[PDB]
Paper text:
Here, we functionally characterize a transcriptional regulator, BrxR, encoded within a recently described phage defence island from a multidrug resistant plasmid of the emerging pathogen Escherichia fergusonii. BrxR comprises an N-terminal winged-HTH domain (residues 1–94), followed by a WYL-domain (so called due to a previous analysis of conserved amino acids), which has been implicated as a potential ligand-binding domain with a role in phage defence (residues 120–190), and a C-terminal dimerization domain (residues 200–295).
The asymmetric unit contained four BrxR dimers, supporting our previous SEC data that indicated BrxR is a dimer in solution. The wHTH domains are exchanged between the protomers, such that upon exiting the wHTH the protein fold crosses to the other side of the dimer, to the WYL-domain. The wHTH domains are spaced ∼25 Å apart in the BrxR dimer, indicating additional movement is required to optimize the positions for interaction with the major grooves of target DNA. Nevertheless, the position of the two sulphates corresponds to a solvent-exposed basic patch formed by each BrxR protomer. These residues are found within the core β-strands but also the conserved loops, such as S143, S145 and S146 on the RT loop; K173 and H174 on the distal loop; and R184 on the 310 α-helix. We propose that ligand-binding at the WYL-domain basic patch could induce conformational changes to BrxREfer that relieve transcriptional repression.
Numbering used by the authors:
A (entry chain A): 7 to 293
B (entry chain B): 8 to 295
The structure:
Amino acid sequence: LEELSQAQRERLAHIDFTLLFKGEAGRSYLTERFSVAPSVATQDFARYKALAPNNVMYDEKRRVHLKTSTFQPLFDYDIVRTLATISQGFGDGFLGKVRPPMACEAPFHLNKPKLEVVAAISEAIHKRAVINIEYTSLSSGHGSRQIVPHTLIDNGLRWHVRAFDRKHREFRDFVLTRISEVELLEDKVNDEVETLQWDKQWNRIVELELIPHPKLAHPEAVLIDYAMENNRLRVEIRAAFAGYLLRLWNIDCSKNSKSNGREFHLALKNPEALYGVDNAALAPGYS
Amino acid sequence: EELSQAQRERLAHIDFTLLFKGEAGRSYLTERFSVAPSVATQDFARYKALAPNNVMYDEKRRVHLKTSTFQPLFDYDIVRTLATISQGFGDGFLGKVRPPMACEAPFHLNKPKLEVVAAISEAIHKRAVINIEYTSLSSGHGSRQIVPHTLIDNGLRWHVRAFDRKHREFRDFVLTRISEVELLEDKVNDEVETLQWDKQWNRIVELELIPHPKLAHPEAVLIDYAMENNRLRVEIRAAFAGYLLRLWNIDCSKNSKSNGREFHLALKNPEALYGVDNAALAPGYSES
């Protein structure tokens, strides 16, 4: 299996995937996905049958290979990336719009940042550069400022950049869809103030204990849902994320689990862990 | 367009690297594509020919540089591209991948089991009935037959939209609470159990989102959500409305007067939620 070309492993994995997620796989799946010759696809299936003979049985009528009752995946899957592929499409995205390969929807996306804005911030992070941006903030409206970006973030809802803000001299999030212009500058980065190692809220990890909400009649449903152990799920997140994510995850973070207005499945067992976390007040019910 | 698919892919990876880093060298192509070192030069030459005003080789740095006049050679799927830079380069079928840059996506908790998602996807593809074990919030553990038709990545969990034969209704099942899946040979009643009869699924609700009225700077929300005429029109399946309005933190109360949650957006027309099952999950929504 490891003697093969990268291209050959990718096409084998696509056979594995198609058998696992559809009932079946034929030469047309490989020629559509990879634009290989039909004769190449035939060799692919032969390599697959040789590597996993008990995974596939051939159907002579329709000329498709069928998933058996004893199927075991030939490869390990990145589950996050695999779920992105079935809900988005098969490429890396660089060759135009793609579409999901199955009846799968992901309706939670609203608008995305502009390609050029994300690319420019990404470039500045890679080059360790200062950038001038225009930014329209909720707190003060439109303006300009210099920032020293260090990380791009897909948070639940929007994209933001974690950066040192030279306007107010603090590390801060900037929502990418509110960045209007990006200009790479030659100004020097102060590696004693402005770089990632000084970002305390970024570098502080908070250890959260999530438990089934006490009001639930069937907490065992939540134990299975979140793959909990010892009645809890331990999650470690950067303090700079805690507010965003606790609200996004709809976690009851009130002391007694009685401040609600919502329909919580999870409660934060140890709200003490949010002490000193900038923007913990975004977490539902946190006081 | 006259090139092989493998060659167009290598040209798109050059375009991406120049766009997202300042630069691109042969090592990026051999790492990503495992082509011979001599193949990468062929790629950059092909790229230089197709877009000469985008690149500028530096002999000392041994690297091709993005010019000030760069315009991407390809169109990008923005959702999938943002996924790739926050997840990694494969399709995911060859093992764990890692982001190609300083980019984090910290909102994922656990995912459904590979075999469970695959079994449901297979049943949807074959238009089959499945027996599942399911642990519900209302009744705990049990088993039932369901007729799945669509897989959903909602904001928070994955679910399958299906006809539930236990209570004879269309319904969501969270994939992480499905423990066993068994494909059946049982016949589907295409007059009761298929997608066309799923009313909440087929009903599209037309939401008008506006900057929240309590904001001092609504102009920040206007650029954020790319609004026009001070509103964003969003069309979603009724079966999604509750989930998504909560996930998006949209104020859906009649007279606002709701800012204990720091909303950036308000639902201008909560009348559009009447008769939507689980509208109650929408922040501040009150019908009766």
